[PDB]
Nucleic acid binder design. Sequence first.
RNA 1: CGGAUUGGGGUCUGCAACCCGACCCCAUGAAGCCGGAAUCGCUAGUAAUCGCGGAUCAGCCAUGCCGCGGUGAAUACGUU
RNA 2: CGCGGGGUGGAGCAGCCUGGUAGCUCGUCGGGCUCAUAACCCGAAGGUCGUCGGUUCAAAUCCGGCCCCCGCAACCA
RNA 3: CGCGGGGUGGAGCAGCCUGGUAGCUCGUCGGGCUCAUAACCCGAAGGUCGUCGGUUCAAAUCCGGCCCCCGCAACCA
RNA 4: UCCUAAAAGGUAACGGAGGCGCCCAAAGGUCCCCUCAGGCGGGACGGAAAUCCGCCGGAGAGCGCAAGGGUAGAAGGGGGCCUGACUGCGAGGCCUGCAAGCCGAGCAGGGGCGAAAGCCGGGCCUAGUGAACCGGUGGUCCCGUGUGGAAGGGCCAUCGA
RNA 5: UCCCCCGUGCCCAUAGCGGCGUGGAACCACCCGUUCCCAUUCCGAACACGGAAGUGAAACGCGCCAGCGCCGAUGGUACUGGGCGGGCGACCGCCUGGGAGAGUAGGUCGGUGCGGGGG
Lengths: 44, 134, 76, 98, 30, 181
Amino acid sequence: LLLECTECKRRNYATEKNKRNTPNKLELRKYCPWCRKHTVHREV
Amino acid sequence: RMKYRKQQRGRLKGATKGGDYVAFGDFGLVALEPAWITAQQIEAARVAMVRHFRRGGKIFIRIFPDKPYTKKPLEVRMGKGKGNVEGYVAVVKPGRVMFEVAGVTEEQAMEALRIAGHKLPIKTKIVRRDAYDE
Amino acid sequence: TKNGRDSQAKRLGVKRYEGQVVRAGNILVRQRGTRFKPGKNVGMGRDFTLFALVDGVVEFQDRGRLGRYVHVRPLA
Amino acid sequence: KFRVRNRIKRTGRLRLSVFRSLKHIYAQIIDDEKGVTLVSASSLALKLKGNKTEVARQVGRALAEKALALGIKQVAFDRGPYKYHGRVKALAEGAREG
Amino acid sequence: VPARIICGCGNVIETYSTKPEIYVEVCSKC
Amino acid sequence: PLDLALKRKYYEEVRPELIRRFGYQNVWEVPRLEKVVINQGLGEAKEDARILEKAAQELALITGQKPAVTRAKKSISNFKLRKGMPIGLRVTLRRDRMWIFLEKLLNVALPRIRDFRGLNPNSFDGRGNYNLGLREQLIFPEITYDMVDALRGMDIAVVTTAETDEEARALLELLGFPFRK
RNA sequence: CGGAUUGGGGUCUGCAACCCGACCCCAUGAAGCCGGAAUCGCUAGUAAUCGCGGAUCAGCCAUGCCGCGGUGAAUACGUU
RNA sequence: CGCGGGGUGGAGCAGCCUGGUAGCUCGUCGGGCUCAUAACCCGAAGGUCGUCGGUUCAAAUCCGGCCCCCGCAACCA
RNA sequence: CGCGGGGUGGAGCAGCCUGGUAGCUCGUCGGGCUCAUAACCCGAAGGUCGUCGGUUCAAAUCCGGCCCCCGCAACCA
RNA sequence: UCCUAAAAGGUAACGGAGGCGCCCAAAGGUCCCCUCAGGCGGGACGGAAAUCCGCCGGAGAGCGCAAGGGUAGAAGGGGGCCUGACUGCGAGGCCUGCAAGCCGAGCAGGGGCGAAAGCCGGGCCUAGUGAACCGGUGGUCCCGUGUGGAAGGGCCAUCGA
RNA sequence: UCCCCCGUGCCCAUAGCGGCGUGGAACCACCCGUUCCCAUUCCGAACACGGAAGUGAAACGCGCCAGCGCCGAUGGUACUGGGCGGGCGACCGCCUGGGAGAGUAGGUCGGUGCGGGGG
Ligand SMILES: [Mg+2]
Ligand SMILES: [Mg+2]
Ligand SMILES: [Mg+2]
Ligand SMILES: [Mg+2]
Ligand SMILES: [Mg+2]
Ligand SMILES: [Mg+2]
Ligand SMILES: [Mg+2]
Ligand SMILES: [Mg+2]
Ligand SMILES: [Mg+2]
Ligand SMILES: [Mg+2]
Ligand SMILES: [Mg+2]
Ligand SMILES: [Mg+2]
Ligand SMILES: [Mg+2]
Ligand SMILES: [Mg+2]
Ligand SMILES: [Mg+2]
Ligand SMILES: [Mg+2]
Ligand SMILES: [Mg+2]
Ligand SMILES: [Mg+2]
Ligand SMILES: [Mg+2]
Ligand SMILES: [Mg+2]
Ligand SMILES: [Mg+2]
Ligand SMILES: [Mg+2]
Ligand SMILES: [Mg+2]
Ligand SMILES: [Mg+2]
Ligand SMILES: [Mg+2]
Ligand SMILES: [Mg+2]
Ligand SMILES: [Mg+2]
Ligand SMILES: [Mg+2]
Ligand SMILES: [Mg+2]
Ligand SMILES: [Mg+2]
Ligand SMILES: [Mg+2]
Ligand SMILES: [Mg+2]
Ligand SMILES: [Mg+2]
Ligand SMILES: [Mg+2]
Ligand SMILES: [Mg+2]
Ligand SMILES: [Mg+2]
Ligand SMILES: [Mg+2]
Ligand SMILES: [Mg+2]
Ligand SMILES: [Mg+2]
Ligand SMILES: [Mg+2]
Ligand SMILES: [Mg+2]
Ligand SMILES: [Mg+2]
Ligand SMILES: [Mg+2]
Ligand SMILES: [Mg+2]
Ligand SMILES: [Mg+2]
Ligand SMILES: [Mg+2]
Ligand SMILES: [Mg+2]
Ligand SMILES: [Mg+2]
Ligand SMILES: [Mg+2]
Ligand SMILES: [Mg+2]
Ligand SMILES: [Mg+2]
Ligand SMILES: [Mg+2]
Ligand SMILES: [Mg+2]
Ligand SMILES: [Mg+2]
Ligand SMILES: [Mg+2]
Ligand SMILES: [Mg+2]
Ligand SMILES: [Mg+2]
Ligand SMILES: [Mg+2]
Ligand SMILES: [Mg+2]
Ligand SMILES: [Mg+2]
Ligand SMILES: [Mg+2]
Ligand SMILES: [Mg+2]
Ligand SMILES: [Mg+2]
Ligand SMILES: [Mg+2]
Ligand SMILES: [Mg+2]
Ligand SMILES: [Mg+2]
Ligand SMILES: [Mg+2]
Ligand SMILES: [Mg+2]
Ligand SMILES: [Mg+2]
Ligand SMILES: [Mg+2]
Ligand SMILES: [Mg+2]
Ligand SMILES: [Mg+2]
Ligand SMILES: [Mg+2]
Ligand SMILES: [Mg+2]
Ligand SMILES: [Mg+2]
Ligand SMILES: [Mg+2]
Ligand SMILES: [Mg+2]
Ligand SMILES: [Mg+2]
Ligand SMILES: [Mg+2]
Ligand SMILES: [Mg+2]
Ligand SMILES: [Mg+2]
Ligand SMILES: [Mg+2]
Ligand SMILES: [Mg+2]
Ligand SMILES: [Mg+2]
Ligand SMILES: [Mg+2]
Ligand SMILES: [Mg+2]
Ligand SMILES: [Mg+2]
Ligand SMILES: [Mg+2]
Ligand SMILES: [Mg+2]
Ligand SMILES: [Mg+2]
Ligand SMILES: [Mg+2]
Ligand SMILES: [Mg+2]
Ligand SMILES: [Mg+2]
Ligand SMILES: [Mg+2]
Ligand SMILES: [Mg+2]
Ligand SMILES: [Mg+2]
Ligand SMILES: [Mg+2]
Ligand SMILES: [Mg+2]
Ligand SMILES: [Mg+2]
Ligand SMILES: [Mg+2]
Ligand SMILES: [Mg+2]
Ligand SMILES: [Mg+2]
Ligand SMILES: [Mg+2]
Ligand SMILES: [Mg+2]
Ligand SMILES: [Mg+2]
Ligand SMILES: [Mg+2]
Ligand SMILES: [Mg+2]
Ligand SMILES: [Mg+2]
Ligand SMILES: [Mg+2]
Ligand SMILES: [Mg+2]
Ligand SMILES: [Mg+2]
Ligand SMILES: [Mg+2]
Ligand SMILES: [Mg+2]
Ligand SMILES: [Mg+2]
Ligand SMILES: [Mg+2]
Ligand SMILES: [Mg+2]
Ligand SMILES: [Mg+2]
Ligand SMILES: [Mg+2]
Ligand SMILES: [Mg+2]
Ligand SMILES: [Mg+2]
Ligand SMILES: [Mg+2]
Ligand SMILES: [Mg+2]
Ligand SMILES: [Mg+2]
Ligand SMILES: [Mg+2]
Ligand SMILES: [Mg+2]
Ligand SMILES: [Mg+2]
Ligand SMILES: [Mg+2]
Ligand SMILES: [Mg+2]
Ligand SMILES: [Mg+2]
Ligand SMILES: [Mg+2]
Ligand SMILES: [Mg+2]
Ligand SMILES: [Mg+2]
Ligand SMILES: [Mg+2]
Ligand SMILES: [Mg+2]
Ligand SMILES: [Mg+2]
Ligand SMILES: [Mg+2]
Ligand SMILES: [Mg+2]
C-alpha cells in the first residue's frame, strides 16, 4: 500500500509506504517540514 | 550415482595426471593413448577377463566413468544434446592404470589382460610390477 | 530450452592500485562483500565500495587472519 | 569482547585504557599508529588509598595533570570490557574534572 | 519463613519455605 | 539465612570424609555442590498460558524461587511447534536457595515418592553431574493436593565441581542422596 | 451399584481333580449408565417376581430340566 | 474514482416502511405413524441480525465513518 | 522430436488453484427380513495418492526429472 | 545469480544451471548485552528431532526469498529508547555511445541513541522494475491577453504502464 | 643494563590442540558478603558494589614434550610467455627465458614494541 505522510498543523507530504492489514492501521511518525522545523505527520 | 546433469567436453591435453602405477594386484593394463572409454567398453573387458579364468582371482578397476555423454537424436540445433546415449565415460590419458589382476598365474594375466585390450579403443600395455613404489 | 538467461556484467574489482596518487574521495575498490577492509583515511559505502577520504597514495596490506586492508598514506 | 576497543581505534586518537582489578584501577593514554603510551596515572601501582570508587576520582584527576603537561584533549575513552558504571565511570568522572 | 515439617514419625525439620504448616506423611526418619 | 542442617552437613560431616576417601591437596579440589536446576518440558500447556501459569507459580513455591520460561527454536510439525512461541519451565538456583530445597527433597520428596527405591545409580553423565526425572510434582512440601489440576511432573539436574562421578557419587551419597546402588 | 478376571491360602468326593470338579476365605475388583436394524412371551391367580423340592448322580461344571408354593398386575375400541 | 443496495440460524431471504416485530424453507435430534425411503403431524438447540460511534424511552430499522461482496456506467498516459 | 491435460481404497470420480484434516457412489465384510437368493434395513473395514529427487516446520496438494494414459499438432516445396 | 569467459575489465550460441516484478514500523536508527550448527553423555511426559545440564565443537549455523561474495573482533539472537524510511546541498569517482545506473567525504538546518569518542540521508550486499507525452489530487515566491478578479497554465509533491 | 609480574599494540599457527611441572611476597584470579550504586526474560552464574579471612583448585603467567594441527627446502617433473619442427587427427617433440602443486629432508610447542608495579 502506497502512503503519503501529511504534516500536522499544515499540509505537507512525504514518500511513504504503509502496510494495511499488517499491524499498521495507525501512522503518525515524526518528520521535518520546510516551513518551520520538525513535527508530527499523519497517514493521509 | 548423482553429480549434476550434462557436462562440457573439454580436451585431452598431455597425459600428465593421465596415468599412475600398479596399485594392487600382480599385473595391470595401461593406456598408451588418450581417449574417452565408455561404460560398455569397460564392462566388456571385465566380463571378458572373468569369462577367461572362470572361478578366478580378483580383477580391479582403477578407472571409472563419470563424464555424461551427450548426443543428438538425428536433428539440427535447438538446445544441447539430451545426451547420455552411450551414457558415460572415463578420461583415460597415456599412462593410466585401468585394470589390476591378482591371484592368477602370468599366462593367465597376460592372456586375460590381453583379451581385454581387444575391447579397448586404444593401444595398451601389460605391466608386471617392477618395484617402483613410493 | 530454458537457459538463455544471464545478468549483465557488473564490472567490479580494484579500481586504483598500490602506489597511485588519489584525489579527495575517489573510488579505490568495488567488491562483492568484504574481500577488503577499510583503513587509514578509507571508508566504505553501502555496496562495500572503498573510497579515499583524503588525497595521497594507496597502499595495500595483508593482515592474515585479520583481513586485507587498503589505505591512503597522505602528503601535502 | 574487545569490540568497544576496536570501534574506538577506528575513531582516531588517544585511547584511555581503564584497567581494573579487584582493588585496582589504572589508565594508559596510548597512541596507536605507533603503539606508544604517554600519561599512565596508575593507582595501586601509584600509591593511593583503598576504596575503589573513592580511589577512582583521584587516579582519574591524576592523568589530568600529567595530560595538559604535554598538551592533550582527546577524551577517546577505552571503556574496556567493563560497563560504564562504577569505578570505571568514576575513573572518568575525575579524568574529565581536571 | 522458617518452615516446619511436621511428620507422624518425629523428624520435625525446620528450613525456609512460605507457610511452615508442612504436614509430611512418612518423612526420611522412617 | 546463612545456616542450616544440610548446609552444614556438607561442611561439618561430608567435606572431611571426602578427604578420607580421596584426600586432595587444596581445599578447592574438594568437590562442591554448587548448581541445581529444575525444568518442565511442557509441550502440554504449550497451547494456553492458563495451564502454563499454574505450573510456573506452583513450581515457584517448591523451589521458593522465581521460575523462568524457555522458548522453542526449530519447528516440529510432528508435535505442533514452530518459531519459539511454546514453553519449557526451567529455573536455576544456587547458594542457600538450593540447600534449602535439597533438604526438602532428600528428606521429604524422595520419601513420599510412590514405591521409591533410591535415585537411579546410573544417572551420572560420566562427569561430576546427576539428573533425575519425577512424575507427580505433589511429592513436594508446600504443595497441597486440592491445588493440582494435573499431575504435571518435571526433571532436575545437579552439578558438581568434581571431574569424575565417583567423587560425585561419594559426595551425593554422603549428602543424603539415597541411591538404589 | 456390578461381581468378571487374576493372585494367594485352604476343605470335601473320588484310586486320581495338569488337562478338567465343586466350595471357602483374603485380596484383586472387568465390561456394563438399559442396548442398531430386528425380535420373543403372556389374557388372571396369568406376566412379572421370590424362593423350596425332585429325578440323574461319588462329586459336579444345573443358570438346565421336571414339579411346588409365596407376593401379584396391565390391557383387549376392533378384525382393516 | 464517483453512482446504487445489501452482509439475518448449517444456506439465503422476509423483517430495513412509516422504530415498539427473528420468522420461512430445507437441515439436526427426539417422538407419532408406515413393509419401507419418503410424504406427513408435535416439539427443541444453532443470528455482536458485517463493525464501531450517535438520535431516541425503545433500532435490524433513522444518521456518520468504516469492513467486505454484488451491480452501474465511465477513464487508462 | 512439439504443445496441453491426467495417474487418488477393488471399479469410476472428487480433493490440489488458495499446503495441516483423503470425500462420494458401486463393490467388499459382519448382522437382520425371507423358506431361500435379489432387493431393502443396521454396522464396519479398505487408500505407499505412478516412481525417483527437491522446497517447507510440514507435500496427494508446490518445483524438477523419468515412466504410463488421453487431446492437438507434424505444413511449403 | 553462477558457469562458459582463456587468474584485469569485457566477451557469443535456440551453450549448462537457477531466481526477480516482492517483503519488513520492525526485518529500520542507535546504546547495552549475547554467539551457532552440529556430535557424545545425562534427563519425568518427549522422543531420530521439543525443554533441561555437562563436555567437545571457528564457523559446516544464521543473515525474510535464488545464487554468489562476505561474515560471530557481527552483518547473526535479546533488550532500552527511538523514527536520519530527514530537509537544503554535494568535493571527488566508479561505470558508460547516449540516456540511465552506482558509491560518496564534508557544509547548513534541525533531531535520535549514547558517558563519550561518535553513529543515523533505511534494510550484509548485488534482483524486486519503466524515458517522454497526456491527465488526476495537495500545495506554492511565479504567469493571468485593456485594468481588478476568475478561467487556465507554471513551479514543487505525488498518482494512473 | 638484568629478571618477575601487570596493562596495551605489532608479525598473525614455527604463536595452536593436548600432556607434564611450576608461582601467590608484589601483581591477577578465585574467595567473603549483597546494606548501598547496579543487575538476572529465573539465578549476584553474568555484570555491579563493599570487602578481610582463606586459595593457587579453576583461570591465567612460565616452562619442558611433538602425538595432532601449523610451517617446510633441495633436486626433479607438469605447465608455460617468446622462437621452431612433426602426425589425417585425438596429438607430440626441440630451442630460449620463467617454473609449481604434491611428496621428501627438515622446522615449531613462538618473536617483538611501548608503558607501569615489584628485587
Ligand atoms: Mg492511521
Ligand atoms: Mg491517499
Ligand atoms: Mg564415442
Ligand atoms: Mg532443416
Ligand atoms: Mg599372489
Ligand atoms: Mg604370481
Ligand atoms: Mg582392441
Ligand atoms: Mg586396440
Ligand atoms: Mg599390447
Ligand atoms: Mg611411484
Ligand atoms: Mg546467454
Ligand atoms: Mg553475471
Ligand atoms: Mg552477456
Ligand atoms: Mg556472467
Ligand atoms: Mg565517599
Ligand atoms: Mg580532561
Ligand atoms: Mg523458601
Ligand atoms: Mg523404610
Ligand atoms: Mg581438576
Ligand atoms: Mg584437567
Ligand atoms: Mg491354611
Ligand atoms: Mg459405553
Ligand atoms: Mg448411576
Ligand atoms: Mg433348584
Ligand atoms: Mg446331585
Ligand atoms: Mg432350578
Ligand atoms: Mg442508479
Ligand atoms: Mg439460500
Ligand atoms: Mg430466500
Ligand atoms: Mg423469501
Ligand atoms: Mg420440515
Ligand atoms: Mg451450527
Ligand atoms: Mg449472522
Ligand atoms: Mg455469532
Ligand atoms: Mg466472487
Ligand atoms: Mg460475481
Ligand atoms: Mg444494480
Ligand atoms: Mg482426475
Ligand atoms: Mg504428471
Ligand atoms: Mg491417468
Ligand atoms: Mg491425486
Ligand atoms: Mg483407480
Ligand atoms: Mg489404481
Ligand atoms: Mg489397486
Ligand atoms: Mg494435479
Ligand atoms: Mg455400501
Ligand atoms: Mg452383506
Ligand atoms: Mg447379506
Ligand atoms: Mg441360508
Ligand atoms: Mg441377503
Ligand atoms: Mg444380477
Ligand atoms: Mg455394532
Ligand atoms: Mg452402510
Ligand atoms: Mg459404507
Ligand atoms: Mg465408509
Ligand atoms: Mg475411512
Ligand atoms: Mg503425486
Ligand atoms: Mg497429508
Ligand atoms: Mg493431425
Ligand atoms: Mg507452394
Ligand atoms: Mg501455404
Ligand atoms: Mg559473475
Ligand atoms: Mg567462482
Ligand atoms: Mg575474467
Ligand atoms: Mg567468473
Ligand atoms: Mg592466455
Ligand atoms: Mg585474459
Ligand atoms: Mg577452461
Ligand atoms: Mg576473473
Ligand atoms: Mg556448454
Ligand atoms: Mg507494480
Ligand atoms: Mg520494534
Ligand atoms: Mg547443542
Ligand atoms: Mg560425552
Ligand atoms: Mg531417559
Ligand atoms: Mg525429544
Ligand atoms: Mg534424549
Ligand atoms: Mg567462514
Ligand atoms: Mg537460504
Ligand atoms: Mg542465501
Ligand atoms: Mg564469481
Ligand atoms: Mg551466502
Ligand atoms: Mg556462502
Ligand atoms: Mg563462506
Ligand atoms: Mg554461508
Ligand atoms: Mg546486532
Ligand atoms: Mg539489522
Ligand atoms: Mg532495537
Ligand atoms: Mg557527482
Ligand atoms: Mg554519462
Ligand atoms: Mg538499481
Ligand atoms: Mg553498476
Ligand atoms: Mg536484514
Ligand atoms: Mg555487486
Ligand atoms: Mg506521442
Ligand atoms: Mg503537467
Ligand atoms: Mg497560490
Ligand atoms: Mg524558493
Ligand atoms: Mg497579478
Ligand atoms: Mg497571483
Ligand atoms: Mg487582446
Ligand atoms: Mg495596458
Ligand atoms: Mg484581465
Ligand atoms: Mg491557478
Ligand atoms: Mg494549479
Ligand atoms: Mg642503565
Ligand atoms: Mg640506559
Ligand atoms: Mg606497533
Ligand atoms: Mg593439569
Ligand atoms: Mg598461596
Ligand atoms: Mg560460606
Ligand atoms: Mg536481597
Ligand atoms: Mg545489613
Ligand atoms: Mg545510598
Ligand atoms: Mg557504598
Ligand atoms: Mg548497570
Ligand atoms: Mg529480572
Ligand atoms: Mg558498601
Ligand atoms: Mg598461604
Ligand atoms: Mg602456594
Ligand atoms: Mg593451576
Ligand atoms: Mg595454561
Ligand atoms: Mg601443509
Ligand atoms: Mg611441501
Ligand atoms: Mg623445487
Ligand atoms: Mg616453452
Ligand atoms: Mg610456446
Ligand atoms: Mg628457438
Ligand atoms: Mg600436417
Ligand atoms: Mg612445493
Ligand atoms: Mg602427505
Ligand atoms: Mg617428518
Ligand atoms: Mg606447538
Ligand atoms: Mg601450549
Ligand atoms: Mg619495560
Ligand atoms: Mg620497571
Ligand atoms: Mg623500577
